[PDB]
Symmetry: D2
């Protein structure tokens, strides 16, 4: 039968593109979402119209808390309940907002930014391994070493995700599970973002002076889960048009 994948934060944008491209490759998919219920259901309907019984949605908040491990176990469980297997996990969901060093409480900021970007990936990785061409792909960030000003908590999360990618690649290799990352530079600028700000970001990218499409990011995910990546584990592929190479 067809293999199955879980994509977190898959209702919209890059997660959606990844879900779509996995589905087109022949995967059954769990579209995880938090708030974007309408987009998630609409996406599932469309994939199911294409091939019957090949998409389900699964709602979960991925903020850190004492119940986060159970929420992550349930996400993996939902893939098994729908499809009887879980071959691919894609950790895409992410909170991203400034937390200056010098309104959400700081405890909430910690829980959202660290939970979504790192702890949930860890717990989902745990549940995925425990339930078992298996692989996990973590959505990282090409700019981790030249971070956005005042984004310390977000940056800490993405750094933690690099650590998880390496530790899990090492530990899960004996089980045949590969763990890799895809690190976007600037990708899919919101149509609603101010045009002046869009231009500012695009002007920075050496390759084409434009942001990645969501499909370009998805392409690298597709490579990593494929038979063409069978010896690749612990690798993080930047997909950033050379943005990380530009000095101040």
């Amino acid at each position: 039968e067809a293999p199955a994948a879980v994509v977190t934060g898959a209702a919209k944008r890059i997660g959606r593109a990844i879900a779509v491209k996995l589905h087109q490759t022949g995967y059954r998919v769990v579209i995880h979402y938090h708030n974007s219920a309408e987009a998630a259901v609409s996406l599932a309907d469309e994939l199911n119209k294409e091939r019957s019984n090949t998409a389900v949605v699964c709602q979960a908040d991925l903020t850190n808390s004492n119940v986060l491990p159970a929420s992550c176990e349930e996400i993996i469980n939902s893939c098994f309940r729908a499809f009887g297997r879980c071959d691919v996990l894609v950790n895409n969901a992410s909170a991203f907002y400034p937390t200056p060093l010098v309104g959400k409480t700081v405890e909430t900021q910690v829980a959202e930014l660290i939970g979504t970007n790192a702890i949930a990936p860890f717990l989902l990785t745990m549940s995925f391994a425990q339930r078992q061409n298996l692989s996990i792909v973590n959505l990282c960030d090409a700019m981790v070493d030249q971070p956005c000003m005042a984004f310390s908590l977000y940056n800490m999360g993405k750094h933690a995700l690099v650590g998880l990618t390496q530790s899990a690649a090492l530990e899960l290799a004996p089980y045949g599970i590969r763990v890799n990352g895809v690190a976007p530079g600037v990708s899919l600028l919101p149509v609603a973002m101010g045009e002046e700000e869009k231009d500012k970001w695009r002007r920075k990218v050496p390759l084409g002076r434009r942001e990645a499409s969501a499909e370009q990011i998805a392409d690298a995910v597709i490579f990593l889960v494929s038979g063409s990546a069978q010896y690749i584990t612990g690798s993080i592929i930047k997909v950033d048009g050379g943005l990380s190479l530009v000095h101040a």
Copy 2:
């Protein structure tokens, strides 16, 4: 008038060596501790005997929780209460134990390892910067972060997050004249209870001298980073590992 420093997890081992060297350089010190109360009080006593009222102790669990931000604020507050100023913060305290992917619950392991290694350092950095010369913060990192111990994902995640904080905070606090740096030990001060035969196994791996670092050697790099000789150094992580991280499998 003398500068003042907070050192977390300063009762024993590397934190102790750091507190002692800072004190010897002329700093007044807050000795933070968690369970090591006798060691901490004894250390403060020793330092105060050397110079009157230049050391205080401050107890706090640095596990992630709803009360962790207030706890970190109180650690910084304790430096100001005692000394009227806080010039240096050393984020040394750290939980370290395996968390295999395949009697603590996982949510507790997350809270302790991410809390001690990453979140508390963040909240302490926030309180330090907000409460404000040669100001700086030194984070105790790990030379082996990219070749981690098997089954230590949460620990390794916590230390990676700390590298991220060191960079983000260096960038953001530079306009405020606060430098933020790291010291990354390889193998240091193996536990006296570790069998010598196993101590020799890690020792044999170290290119420079086939031995682990003393706590004092780690402290030496901290002393440098807080000194006027490092006035243009920020966002830098100094490995103190005797070549360990350069050795292939």
Copy 3:
């Protein structure tokens, strides 16, 4: 018109797999070689039997010297003269042997190791760019560059320079639509010649399957990078090492 690629050191092993896989993908190929004349011609014959007029050979020493810039110019020229275009350059050729710090003279060792691994890639890159769709360059790097083989300083220096080239050329050539990326093998295709103890030693270190990479698995990463599926990827180095570089001493 079918696109054309140059592969250096393509007569055998990994370079051969790259040439074969590019050819299978529809590329016409220049098979560069140094000493392996019989294998190079044999490979050309084989590919030409598959599709007429799709493979040629080009001999050159890639050791550094006063004549190297002309040699690299002629390698690129061979692609234009044969195929009327050059879309892809793969910098695979490499000298690899120990140069301890404490028959070849040291200046010869420098010329061979830095020439093959770094300077030739630079001059070929120069020639390729100046002679100019989906254009790209792939440099064969090394996943163990930061945990190098003992006594291989010159080899390691060359591979580090190659990372620098990959990055510098990615930045500079991005405006011309030329992408520049790397593939970094761990251990790959152990020779039968090598000892049974030595080969086992290396194999048992690889977390993912306790075996070396096949040449085809290395070639798969090259194919991805030159493909339309990597159109936004430049300055990236993809490790293909089965997790070898993650394993501590």
Copy 4:
């Protein structure tokens, strides 16, 4: 006996600051230079005026060639000739200029940029080790991963120098020789004038100022000192946060 140090490209700027600082800490120094004869002799004179017979100059081109190994061996030899010992080697000399991919020939550019920044440090390291608190400090670059546009050969050279620092740290550890790097960001602005200087200054998070030569030398002094006895294969960035700033 006082320890002795070789500093390459030490007639001016950062090399001189390092030479001056080592001398002040008690070292006897070989001031290597290439073209800056007057400046080198002048520094040796000032240092010898402070302490008699504690400085000598040594001329050498560090461009790659077949005689480069002999030249590097002779630099180390000159320290032993003058001082009877050689405790510290600082690889500071560097060529730095653009070499675009698209009147110096390319073979000259390769020779100068790879020679000065990488091959000469390798050859000096060999000769330093062979001739034996011993250590080597390499002058690297904090911006190696966000390079100057059209400086590929320079960038390759400094990357090779990171590789040397790591390889030699590993290999020379059994011999008790530590090998470390100092990676400046922007330091000492000259050739260049204001306002281009102030364009660079505005980039630096920590004080919007370039590093002083003194600040770079401070980091060198630390790595050679007893306070760094367990540090080897480490590269210390001295860049005021410059490398942390995104485009």
